[PDB]
Design a protein around this ligand. Sequence first.
Ligand SMILES: Nc1ncnc2c1ncn2[C@@H]1O[C@H](COP(=O)(O)OP(=O)(O)O)[C@@H](O)[C@H]1O
Lengths: 242, 240, 240, 87, 48, 238, 239, 232
Amino acid sequence: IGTGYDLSASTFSPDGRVFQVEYAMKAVENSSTAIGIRCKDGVVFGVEKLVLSKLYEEGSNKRLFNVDRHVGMAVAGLLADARSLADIAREEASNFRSNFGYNIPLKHLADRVAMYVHAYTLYSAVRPFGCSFMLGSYSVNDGAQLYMIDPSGVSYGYWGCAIGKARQAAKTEIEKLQMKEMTCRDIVKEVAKIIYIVHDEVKDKAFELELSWVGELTNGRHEIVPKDIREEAEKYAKESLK
Amino acid sequence: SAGFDRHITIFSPEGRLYQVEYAFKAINQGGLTSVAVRGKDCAVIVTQKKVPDKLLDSSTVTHLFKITENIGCVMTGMTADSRSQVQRARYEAANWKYKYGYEIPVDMLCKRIADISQVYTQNAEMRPLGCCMILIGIDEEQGPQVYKCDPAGYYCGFKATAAGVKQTESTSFLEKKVKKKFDWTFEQTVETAITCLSTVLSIDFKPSEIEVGVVTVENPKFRILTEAEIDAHLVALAER
Amino acid sequence: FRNQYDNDVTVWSPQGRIHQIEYAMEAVKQGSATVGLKSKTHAVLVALKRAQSELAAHQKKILHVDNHIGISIAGLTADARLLCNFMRQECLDSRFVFDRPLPVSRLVSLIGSKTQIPTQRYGRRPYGVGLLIAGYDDMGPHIFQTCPSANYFDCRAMSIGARSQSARTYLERHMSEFMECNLNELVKHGLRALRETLPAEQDLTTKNVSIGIVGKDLEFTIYDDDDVSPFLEGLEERPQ
Amino acid sequence: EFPMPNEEARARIMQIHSRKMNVSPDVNYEELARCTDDFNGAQCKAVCVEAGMIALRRGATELTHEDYMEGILEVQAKKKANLQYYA
Amino acid sequence: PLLHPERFVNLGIEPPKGVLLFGPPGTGKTLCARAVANRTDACFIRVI
Amino acid sequence: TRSEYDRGVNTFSPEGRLFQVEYAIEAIKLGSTAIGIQTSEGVCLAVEKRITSPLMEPSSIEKIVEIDAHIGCAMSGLIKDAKTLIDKARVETQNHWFTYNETMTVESVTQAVSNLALQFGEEDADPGAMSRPFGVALLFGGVDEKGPQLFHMDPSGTFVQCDARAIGSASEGAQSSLQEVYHKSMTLKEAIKSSLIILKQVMEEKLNATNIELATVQPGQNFHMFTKEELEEVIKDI
Amino acid sequence: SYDRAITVFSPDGHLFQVEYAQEAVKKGSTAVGVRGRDIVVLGVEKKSVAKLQDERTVRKICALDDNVCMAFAGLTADARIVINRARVECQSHRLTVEDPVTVEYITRYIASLKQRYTQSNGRRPFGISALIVGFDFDGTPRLYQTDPSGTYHAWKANAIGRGAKSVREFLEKNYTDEAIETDDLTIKLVIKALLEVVQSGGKNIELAVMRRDQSLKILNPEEIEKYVAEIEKEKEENE
Amino acid sequence: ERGYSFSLTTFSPSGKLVQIEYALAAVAGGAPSVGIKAANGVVLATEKKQKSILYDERSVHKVEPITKHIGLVYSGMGPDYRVLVHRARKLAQQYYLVYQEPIPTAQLVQRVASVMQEYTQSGGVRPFGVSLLICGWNEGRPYLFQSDPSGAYFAWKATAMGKNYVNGKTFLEKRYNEDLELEDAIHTAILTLKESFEGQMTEDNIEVGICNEAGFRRLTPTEVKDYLAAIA
Ligand SMILES: Nc1ncnc2c1ncn2[C@@H]1O[C@H](COP(=O)(O)OP(=O)(O)O)[C@@H](O)[C@H]1O
């Protein structure tokens, strides 16, 4: 159980593991589920948002942010953590633009944000950012990339990944989908049905689906799904979820 | 006896720094392994690749990197510590090039980054970056060098080195090969590395599960051995 | 003690929770209830004033920060007051540099950024104050509830504090009129909400209630015993 | 795995523990269930039989919804802190 | 229950079966019990 | 197990309480009883001396002090804590009489003093400030544009306008008595008589000239602390 | 628990480190000071030097300014530090305002210094209590006691250190208006209070007298034998 | 006694800082090293033996020069030794810049002792787990010093610390004489390495540096092999 070793993030285990980042893993797996898929000419994002109370307005706690004009922001974990990480990432992108004069590559932004989130992982006076976030972009001269960065600090490249209480579940049902060929039009449908099947209705009901994407379909610009395409995706979901 | 294994800055009885050994054990926690072999004018680095699913982008999960245009790097352990340490190494190499006007020798790069890790393990403000490093390169009047760095800041040159879960058996196999006193040509060095990995793992891996980097005197650039050439090398090893 | 995981905000539970943050969240459950409603063009904040003794004035729970934006506090006096001076300084800085009112969403975003630092970094205690934010901007009225977990929500309504679940379920019963109500209707709805919070022996007297209303053309104005008198004259009688 | 009691779990739990009570049908167990956020299990005993004893507090009335909401509001937190220095 | 049994009869509730008066020594537990015994028209039992 | 949360002010109880602040609050009861009452004609402040030795110089022990000619103070808690608080209050009142060249209202006085208070857990203490909550409860009274005004300050930084507030060792009992002895139309003379009556009922010893310090602030005159002869006059009636 | 932390309130509202520092004075030595009509006197029990200590550097009574003096009880290093700081502050005050420092100002400075030394961790409180004496510009006799808690108070005649309670009761029973009519009467009172606790007499007592701006000279060990001859003479005179 | 063996700023009720003693225990577990001061010069040596001949012995050197006439050897931690070398070089070169004269070895030892005892001043920073042997020649006199993790520094006609240091010290005190010559000093040093070398020293298994009137120089592998053969 590691008692006496997991009171700080600068203390290793007898097996050689920092238990703070593992507890952050646990917190992320105890959070909401978000999927993303990169299409042929862009990337799309999907958030399963639980309406804890109908008193909450729609669009509250918006979770699919956009770090840059061409870079989105999907994230699972703590909303305060999500906003702080988004803010530091936005400042990083703005500094990159101010110093280097062009758009930040997704891989380079992921590397910088992973270094920064690591800088909060290994200190003792601070705590690792217990939230896992997504990076997505589309550049006409670079391509499309997707990255998942967890509080552990590892920024690996995933074609399309999920984070939350249905990590393995979403892996099982996103593996059956063929991915690399179709574009956002034929990928939003799959994302919608995947999100609507991973959610549990008997327990943790009352969820809504919000979506966002980046790509040439909006001129390499990240934005939420248009209301018409949004209701069309919901209609395909209700038809396909039967 | 015990109870002194809580702070990096606390000396236990018998003067034993527990937490540093805890970090060394954390090196293994990555679950991977890596080996480096050096020839007369070549130095081959090979590392294992484990993919939980096809869902990941294999082009970004490389475990070996390039510090400067002629200095390559491989490492293992926690991947976040790995990328932070390669960022610091690149920063230090660029600073050295800026200040002194010529490329960083492998030995000096290892020395400086090991000094950084020592300062990390000397003061209690830092978790000592629990990832081990292996650096390769070519230097004039000395030839190829292979150097290893560890979180404790202990650095040393190696004719052949290893890391990961299978450290001790890989080192024993390396000793068994080097005691025969053979020249280790470039293809021979690469094949010794592949055979070491395959036997210590007992897997006889498919060529898609290994990343290889090599630096030679005729190719001072750190060349990441592409899929075509690694296929050639290791399927030739298969038939050879 | 298995709860050695709640002595500072910088440690996680084995189950992946920050119990200090949860205690800060429960802290604002101690303060008196406060419910807010918003119309097509008008947002109301109505709170239940409390007094240390009947021989002394009731504790103010509605705070004016700027002509268009207003806040209501429920929790620690110190943290809420500090947040209020921070709000006033930022609203003034926005008026000085941009000559435009601070957006409600932007104000709440900077509130979240400010209050996350105590949650993330050792030192300052987490801001254990539940804030109800009601203002006006381009797309009309907004009600923002900033939970002391450094989180905020865009809500049609919210009651935060002691026995606020009664008001929550009252509003859950009465969504269907909030959007289309005028000033008097929404005010009476909020008053019925607090009356639901208040037990049987007590009633919403003049000294007991505090009402803050903002709108498109009407600034964030807070009413008192004499000022709440016309608004409570239209108030009905308690359905007891 | 024993999860958090559900709304139906509550409704039936105070129904069975209160099956010995003379509760009038004027109550609404489901709304109590939806106000039983973080009220779990043995907290029947509180809401439930303490609601019988609150009907005693209320003056030996029928087990109407009034005492059930009261018990929900009180449960373990029936004590009122009434604490200063809180705005 | 003792002086008003009919209310728990027509409320269909079993009267309280046991009560524990736990507190620090000298608080008055014994004395309060004896006082309520006197005022409940029932004889007090002392079991050391 | 409370013990893990009393150590330090930056801890939160499972009930969300500030145990260090609560201990500071209870530390007010270590101080002597102070009673202030608000009337239309003004405010009067009555306190207990608690003289340790007859050889003591009564001028040294200060339970009521002047922040400005228009305002008055009362203390209960640590002497040095209140000394810093009162010095800051006087500096602030001169800051206002500098910036706006006007007499600054008692509610703003308690605002600024509470700003110095509740700063214990603030990162601006890097130059040096309270790492611990201030341990004195303040009673502010005076006359401003809103007429006579009395404010009670809580070491947590909270303030409330009170018609009649009692702080110190006997705050509960004195407050309970003031609850029924106070009327809104009470004159200054009868209010001060009632205040000394409460002190007599509350104080541990007999009331003599060296047991009570008395203060008054009225719209007409400035802050006046009752002299020995004035104290004798006001105590001979009672 | 709640004792090993300077800035942590106890559940019963005590800063126990401050009270422990205050109690540390009671383990010092008796130091009693009385203010008269035109004089102020300082009586302190002197540690009998065994065989080799140089009494010139065992200074228990020191003057902060030409118009103020002070005796201390507590750890000597703390007393030396506070003496240096307080006399530096007297000189800086004369730099700022050019007039001699009043006893109230220097006592307030000493109290504030001790207080700022007892409100944060990593700073141990000054465990010394000092009796401040001196005359103002208008020559009013004032005497102040400073407490390691960081507070000060005006005392007509106070005693600190070990046995300070006995000297306090003695002064309560013997301090009269006519007892300060003459300098010799004040001296008789102060030596009587001293010999209450240090009954050996003769040595082990040091005295200092400040008249109306005489730049006090400590009573030298020729008339302490003379003054104790006077004390013994009056003592066999009333008995 | 256990509650005081955890910080460097708390005195044990009986003795002194226990973390310093534990750093010394770390020192005594290091690689054996022997320094000998002859009449005309000084010699210091150490054992470089390590498993996995794969290791490049030339890559790192345990004997390093500080200036043209000052050299040093250690026993204990490696990286701490490197850091000490860096700080010593910086300090000696600062002295050179200020005075434009080769730094006397006594002042170098004093300054390095001050810098290492600086790490012992406060908590949060562990003391160096390394003891230093300083060799130097100046004013027609060979100087040999030992620098401690505690910051203590003392002189030594001939000493040996590290593993099996007590036996080496007994050997030295049963061998050393005040009229020893440089070559005989090297012979005695290699013999001291031998009596606890445990495994047949080679030319590269040990590392020996020498200082004399002609400055300090670490012996090349060829001369080391020649001396090893001469001793046999
Ligand atoms: N509430 C109370 N009213 C009157 N007397 C009390 C009260 N509490 C305690 N006492 C006194 O305490 C004394 C002993 O109390 P006791 O009942 O023995 O304490 P315990 O509850 O530990 O048995 C009695 O003589 C009684 O006078």
